[PDB]
Structure 1
Amino acid sequence: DDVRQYVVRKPLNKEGKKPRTKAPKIQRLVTPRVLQHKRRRIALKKQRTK
């Protein structure tokens, strides 16, 4: 199930500006970038043994 689906969103309704909603940056979220970093670390191990 998707954690990013269920984020607690915060409204923002101040006069003189457009009413908008903010959401936080989710931490400890698996993304392609952390997986790419993991692959890079294992690659560094590979070249060191070679």
Structure 2
Amino acid sequence: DDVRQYVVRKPLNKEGKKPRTKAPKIQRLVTPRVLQHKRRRIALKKQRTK
């Protein structure tokens, strides 16, 4: 399942500005950038053996 969309949201209300909602940055999500760092980590091992 997708871990996004199920994340809890916090509503903001005050007399001045419009309503808003907040949610946190997620800390173990395995995005494409995490996978890209894992690929270079093993490309450096191959280069040293050559």
Structure 1 alignment gaps of length 5 or more: none
3-state SS in 1 of match to 2:5: helix
After TM superposition, the runs of 4+ consecutive aligned structure 1 residues lying more than 4 A away are none
TM-score (norm 1): 0.91
What do residues 1-27 of structure 1 show as CA deviations (whole Å, max 9, x unaligned)? 011121001111111011100110000
Task: Among all aligned residue pairs of Structure 1 and Structure 2, give the percentage whose two residues are the same amino acid.
Answer: 100
TM-score (norm 2): 0.91
Deviation at 1:34, TM superposition (A): 0.3
User: Quick check: which one's helix share is greater?
Assistant: 1
Structure 2 alignment gaps of length 5 or more: none
Question: What is the CA RMSD across the aligned residues, in angstroms?
Answer: 0.8
1: CA distance, partners of 2:25 / 2:15 = 26
